[PDB]
Amino acid sequence: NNPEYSSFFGVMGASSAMVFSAMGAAYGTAKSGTGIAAMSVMRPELIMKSIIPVVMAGIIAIYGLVVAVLIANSLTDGITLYRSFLQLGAGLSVGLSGLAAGFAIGIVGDAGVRGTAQQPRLFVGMILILIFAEVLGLYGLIVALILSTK
Amino acid sequence: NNPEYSSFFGVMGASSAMVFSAMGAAYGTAKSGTGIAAMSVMRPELIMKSIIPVVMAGIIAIYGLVVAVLIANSLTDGITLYRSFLQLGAGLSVGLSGLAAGFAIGIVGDAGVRGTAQQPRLFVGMILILIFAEVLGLYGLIVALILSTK
Amino acid sequence: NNPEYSSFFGVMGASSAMVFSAMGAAYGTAKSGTGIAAMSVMRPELIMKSIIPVVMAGIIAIYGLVVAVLIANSLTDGITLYRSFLQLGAGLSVGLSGLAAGFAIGIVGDAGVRGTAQQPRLFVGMILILIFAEVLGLYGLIVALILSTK
Amino acid sequence: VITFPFLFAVMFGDFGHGILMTLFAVWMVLRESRILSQKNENEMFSMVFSGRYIILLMGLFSIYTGLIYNDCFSKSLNIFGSSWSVRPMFTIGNWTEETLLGSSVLQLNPAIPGVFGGPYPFGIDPIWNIATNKLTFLNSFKMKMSVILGIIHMLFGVSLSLFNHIYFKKPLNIYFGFIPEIIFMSSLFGYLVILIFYKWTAYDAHSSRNAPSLLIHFINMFLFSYPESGNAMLYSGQKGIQCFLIVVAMLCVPWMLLFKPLILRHQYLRKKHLEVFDFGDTMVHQAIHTIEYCLGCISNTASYLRLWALSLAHAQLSEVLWTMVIHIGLHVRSLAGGLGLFFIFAAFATLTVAILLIMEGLSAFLHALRLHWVEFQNKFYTGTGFKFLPFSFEHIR
Amino acid sequence: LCCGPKLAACGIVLSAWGVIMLIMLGIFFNVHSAVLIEDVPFTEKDFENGPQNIYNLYEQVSYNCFIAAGLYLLLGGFSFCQVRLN
Amino acid sequence: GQFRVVKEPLGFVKVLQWVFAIFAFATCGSYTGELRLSVECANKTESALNIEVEFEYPFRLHQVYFDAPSCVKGGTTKIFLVGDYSSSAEFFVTVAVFAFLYSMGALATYIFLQNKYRENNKGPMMDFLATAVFAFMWLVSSSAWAKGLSDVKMATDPENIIKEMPMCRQTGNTCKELRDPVTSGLNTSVVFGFLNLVLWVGNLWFVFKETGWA
Amino acid sequence: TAHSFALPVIIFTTFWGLIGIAGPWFVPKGPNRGVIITMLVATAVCCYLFWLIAILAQLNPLFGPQLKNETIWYVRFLWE
Amino acid sequence: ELFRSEEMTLAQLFLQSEAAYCCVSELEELGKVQFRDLNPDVNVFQRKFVNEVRRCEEMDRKLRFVEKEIRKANIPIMDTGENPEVPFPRDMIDLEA
């Protein structure tokens, strides 16, 4: 029969998927918000357009939530150790990829908002770079989904 | 079987849910309070409005308290190991997500408060960014509840 | 018979293949994004050309995703320990090679963008340097393909 | 005007919150004269008011999508009568009071003919809001919906590109782009939509024990790695049809890439010699366009899962904000629970407005904007024009 | 008593929302609608003899919701009065 | 006052439309019915000698149930009845209430304010529109209620219940009806539906003259 | 409680097809005509597709829900 | 319509210097045109009518000062919404007085 401690790795997959995605989103929001705060003192009207980096950072927390809820609803008492490993792998693959995407979003958003304060034309390029930064968390989600549903 | 030590992981879930959420709130209150003190030297009328970040930092700790109380009520001497792991997962998911939310709130509150000292229009932008940051703690709470009541 | 813990190395192979490629792409996107933002203050015309470093960084994340998908698709519960180790090796070889490639892309992209603002002649050499920094991800991908499909 | 509200509604689907949003939009539209005359520096209010006509359609279509999800503040409505029924598990099945007593969460199946009575005629069956296995079904349905909507939307944009090409007389664009572009997209990802609908219309509980996985088959379809153990084939002739599809997809990449630079070389460097043409730069340009087209197809098809991601986030946040605010006042034995509900409902209203309508509404808004800007407009809309800014008496302010 | 017009407007809007939603919620509980079972305060020993034992508690929660709706209607009236003063 | 108006072809028709649909409510909305049967099981000592069950006018019968025998160990099984017919019966009685209220209000206008009714033929126009809507209402509700009353009879029929009950499908058992709910009141209800429909169709001309369109 | 899968498809298909095909002709001859027609057609597409996906996702299910024994005991009485 | 961008074209004017003011006032009222700068090589302060522009700015300073004093006072500013196109003849001198 399957081992008793098997559910541990699945539960850690869920908690990791949520925790590291939350850390990535927190860092992204922190840096982007600092950028917006510095930008505002000079260019007030850009404040709302410049919240977009915060939103793209929050996407990463939403991705972590998706994987965490999916794993949590997939957990069972008799979970085979193989499924527990799949869930742990998916959880980390989304959580740490989201952490990296949060780093990218935070740094790019801070620098890009500060720049867009000084030169409005940057906004489009900043959005493109933020998209390239967020698609990393998206790829992490894809890997997590393939692992988990497998 | 249900080994004799099984409740250890549930107790650690409760302890984590409270401790890590409290540290998130403590940081989100320390940074925010330093920012408020630095701002108030010149804008004494903004203190009450600028206390909001402290309130959301406290909300993080309240999420932690909710999940910690839930785990501590779900604990039992014969708690099966699978349930104990679920509770540990909930504890970490709320605690460390609240810690990330607290860091985000602290940084955002400090920067935005020092900004709204100099540009009042930044206040509502701060409010939006802070709600985004606190929604990270809320996601942590959601996953924690799902795990604990799974 | 094959050990129940065999799949752990495969799931870590996939998770690593995605996580480290994502970290490399995140560094490459972030530093090149700060470079683009700093450049755009003076030379807005160059944003859409200078975006290329970010595309190079993203291709590393795509390499990571492809290897992670191969591994995840090839996972099973009875996966023989030999195949599990092969998949861990593929995951590391592409993940950390992409990590190094993304770090090189970030550094050279930032330097090349900032230099190209000053000296347009630098653009072609920046392209060459980015290609040399990026084919490291391709070598990692080749090794990972061999190990994973072996 | 329509797809942006519609995709926002896919993300924000909730009939009640849609009611609130429509009421707000109607309030602003009706009071627009007063609001227009009473201008002030309130950035939030002024911007939202300028967007008022967007929010009207946003709220209405969030109402529609919440009804299709059959959700209302995290609760379904059950107006047509559920298709799922429990009594056949006892009448025809082998259940009993002892089984209910001995199992806490138990099960349900449609194999016995009486349980399942066809699809709930307007949206999702209401039983899912009380089923614990809810998300096992909802996540699959929403992943498939996201894939379908994204693929159809990207195909729509690709089609719109033709209306530009014909007018502008870009015959090489037409014939070695759009036709190859749409062929690529339909062969690779349109086939996935076809497979999704095929699985829904073909595979059943009687095939449950061996039903395949679309993700695994779709990836092995790229790898040409048809297995011979485990799950079974989706339909007869799939090997051949899939092989044809992948082969055409492969051929299309050179088809999009090589011919444009080559025919441009022909007609602008061999002719007119037997502004100037540069073979290397044009080759790099068209190689860039093709690499971007293909990797953009994959990344954008994946990115449309953003719909499901946000839908799940919204659904779970509404569920928690119900079940741990107003559930508190509802699940109390005493009659003072009415006053408790008064206060708890004040809290519920404030928190729901702060979180669901503001945070998640804003996230859905900006995600639909992002999708339109990139994942849909990259297909046709180049977007490098100017704004006609006329000498036309703006000085009324 | 007196209050700011913005406070009064918020009060009246909140009162309208509360009245509508809680009247509907009370209606739906008195209907014994299934989708709201989890919120009924019943106990594990109430499942013995039939649905009536839990129908009664459904009725109780519906009465609580109606009482809350009445409170919100009174609040709405007071907020409308405040708006009229402003 | 204008009490003489109640004699007139319009006032008399309103009195008719008021007594009708009131008798319809009295026959339909007041209905509570009962059902009985008996079984002699293969083992005579396990016989289900007496069965009794009851129902009400909304006819949500599938929520009604009774403890039939299983002819094994003398234990019982929970036989729920068949279907629900609210869309027929509740809709019919709601239409009856609508028509009753409107005709009461029309008599109130006739007796004291018929001049206000005749003003600019607006009263005639509104009454013509009311007649037009009630024609459709009674038509659809009466068709649905005829089919629904047939369905109620088929669902309550003790012999149908016996045929659905699988005891006769075992050997040895015998089953029979003991009571069948009364039908005259519900037949009278649907009869009132048809009579109200024909009156509402006929009154179109009676009001068309007042509108001036006749 | 059988919702035969012929009536719902007929009803909603004729409904949305009429909205998207006949309504365009009923829009009057005016300046905003083109935008209005586009709204009608694309609303038809979006909403009809959403409903069709939702109903086909339930057509031929592979598994049935999972229910707490309390809600089993309740719905057993409540629903047909 | 909103389907795609409206057909657009460039045009040029040879216009009597006296009638230029009248025509630009009428074209401002009409509002279906966008002027383009033909002499950007010389800064915008070194040009002919910039003196009249400076006089208009002095007038606007006067009016804004009076408007600020009105705001400080309790008397309302009327919002009648009259939108005449200013004529060419020297109403400027009367308004300056």
From Swiss-Prot, chains A, B, C:
Source domain of life is Eukaryota
Give the GO terms filed under biological process for this record: negative regulation of autophagic cell death; positive regulation of ERK1 and ERK2 cascade; positive regulation of Wnt signaling pathway; synaptic vesicle lumen acidification
The alphabetical list of record keywords is: Cytoplasmic vesicle, Hydrogen ion transport, Ion transport, Membrane, Synapse, Transmembrane, Transmembrane helix, Transport, Ubl conjugation
Q: Which InterPro entries match?
A: ATPase_proteolipid_c-like_dom (IPR002379), ATPase_proteolipid_csu (IPR000245), ATPase_proteolipid_su_C_euk (IPR011555), F/V-ATP_Csub_sf (IPR035921)
Give the way it sits in the membrane: Multi-pass membrane protein
Q: Which residues are on the Cytoplasmic side of the membrane?
A: 29-50, 110-126
The record's principal subcellular location, in a coarse class, is: membrane
For molecular function, the Gene Ontology terms on record are: proton-transporting ATPase activity, rotational mechanism; ubiquitin protein ligase binding
User: Which tissues and organs express this gene's product?
Assistant: Expressed in brain (at protein level).
**Signal peptide (residue range):** none
Note the site residues: Essential for proton translocation: 134
Q: Name one GO cellular component term.
A: synaptic vesicle membrane
The PTM entry states:
Ubiquitinated by RNF182, leading to its degradation via the ubiquitin-proteasome pathway.
The record places the following residue ranges in the Lumenal compartment, namely: 72-87, 148-150
Transmembrane domains' residue ranges: 6-28, 51-71, 88-109, 127-147
Where in or outside the cell is it found? Cytoplasmic vesicle, Clathrin-coated vesicle membrane; Cytoplasmic vesicle, Secretory vesicle, Synaptic vesicle membrane
Q: Which PANTHER family match?
A: V-TYPE PROTON ATPASE PROTEOLIPID SUBUNIT
Family classification: Belongs to the V-ATPase proteolipid subunit family.
Task: Please report the name of this protein according to its UniProt entry.
Answer: V-type proton ATPase 16 kDa proteolipid subunit c
Species of origin = Rattus norvegicus
Q: What gene is it encoded by?
A: Atp6v0c
From Swiss-Prot, chain D:
Principal location class: membrane
What is a single cellular component term in the Gene Ontology annotation? synaptic vesicle membrane
All ranges on the Vacuolar side of the membrane: 13-14, 77-140, 200-244, 316-336
- Which stretches of this protein does UniProt put in the Cytoplasmic compartment? 32-46, 161-178, 376-397
Record flagged with keyword Transport: yes
GO MF annotations, alphabetized: ATPase binding; proton-transporting ATPase activity, rotational mechanism
Q: Which GO terms describe its biological process?
A: regulation of macroautophagy; synaptic vesicle lumen acidification; vacuolar acidification
Cystines in this chain: none
Quote the subcellular location field of this record.
Cytoplasmic vesicle, Clathrin-coated vesicle membrane; Cytoplasmic vesicle, Secretory vesicle, Synaptic vesicle membrane; Melanosome
Give the domain of life: Eukaryota
TM regions (residue ranges)? 1-12, 15-31, 47-76, 141-160, 179-199, 245-264, 291-315, 337-375
**Record's keyword terms, sorted:** Cytoplasmic vesicle, Hydrogen ion transport, Ion transport, Membrane, Phosphoprotein, Synapse, Transmembrane, Transmembrane helix, Transport
How this chain assembles, per its entry, is:
V-ATPase is a heteromultimeric enzyme made up of two complexes: the ATP-hydrolytic V1 complex and the proton translocation V0 complex. The V1 complex consists of three catalytic AB heterodimers that form a heterohexamer, three peripheral stalks each consisting of EG heterodimers, one central rotor including subunits D and F, and the regulatory subunits C and H. The proton translocation complex V0 consists of the proton transport subunit a, a ring of proteolipid subunits c9c'', rotary subunit d, subunits e and f, and the accessory subunits ATP6AP1/Ac45 and ATP6AP2/PRR. Interacts with SPAAR.
Family (UniProt) = Belongs to the V-ATPase 116 kDa subunit family.
Swiss-Prot record, chain F:
Which residue numbers delimit the MARVEL domain? Answer: 5-212
- Give the Vesicular membrane side ranges: 34-91, 147-184
The stretch of the full-length protein covered here is 11 to 224 of 307
- Residues with attached carbohydrate: 43
The text of the family note is: Belongs to the synaptophysin/synaptobrevin family.
Which species does the entry assign this protein to? Answer: Rattus norvegicus (Rat)
User: Which residues, if any, are the signal sequence?
Assistant: none
Entry-annotated residues carrying Phosphothreonine: 211
Q: What is its quaternary makeup? A: Homohexamer or homotetramer. Interacts with SRCIN1. Interacts with VAMP2; the interaction is inhibited by interaction of VAPM2 with SEPT8.
> How is this protein annotated for GO cellular component?
excitatory synapse; membrane; neuromuscular junction; neuron projection; neuron projection terminus; neuron spine; perinuclear region of cytoplasm; postsynaptic density
In-chain residues carrying the UniProt-annotated modification Phosphotyrosine: 65
Mind telling me what this protein is named? Synaptophysin
Domain comment (free text):
The calcium-binding activity is thought to be localized in the cytoplasmic tail of the protein.
Q: How does it sit in the membrane?
A: Multi-pass membrane protein
GO MF terms held by the record = cholesterol binding; identical protein binding; protein domain specific binding; protein-containing complex binding; SH2 domain binding; SNARE binding; syntaxin-1 binding
TM ranges = 10-33, 92-115, 123-146, 185-208
Please tell me in which tissues this protein is expressed. Expressed in the brain with expression in the cerebrum and the cerebellum.
Q: Which residues lie on this side of the membrane: Cytoplasmic?
A: 116-122
Transmembrane: is it a keyword of this entry? yes
Taxonomically, the superkingdom here is Eukaryota
From Swiss-Prot, chain G:
Keyword Transmembrane helix carried by entry: yes
Keyword annotations for this protein, in alphabetical order, are: Cytoplasmic vesicle, Glycoprotein, Hydrogen ion transport, Ion transport, Membrane, Synapse, Transmembrane, Transmembrane helix, Transport
Reported function: Subunit of the V0 complex of vacuolar(H+)-ATPase (V-ATPase), a multisubunit enzyme composed of a peripheral complex (V1) that hydrolyzes ATP and a membrane integral complex (V0) that translocates protons. V-ATPase is responsible for acidifying and maintaining the pH of intracellular compartments and in some cell types, is targeted to the plasma membrane, where it is responsible for acidifying the extracellular environment.
Q: How does it assemble?
A: V-ATPase is a heteromultimeric enzyme made up of two complexes: the ATP-hydrolytic V1 complex and the proton translocation V0 complex. The V1 complex consists of three catalytic AB heterodimers that form a heterohexamer, three peripheral stalks each consisting of EG heterodimers, one central rotor including subunits D and F, and the regulatory subunits C and H. The proton translocation complex V0 consists of the proton transport subunit a, a ring of proteolipid subunits c9c'', rotary subunit d, subunits e and f, and the accessory subunits ATP6AP1/Ac45 and ATP6AP2/PRR.
What does UniProt note about where in the body, tissue by tissue, this protein is expressed? Expressed in brain (at protein level).
Instruction: Name one molecular function that GO assigns to this entry.
Output: proton-transporting ATPase activity, rotational mechanism
Sequence ranges on the Lumenal membrane side: 1-6, 56-80
Question: Where are the glycosylation sites?
Answer: 69
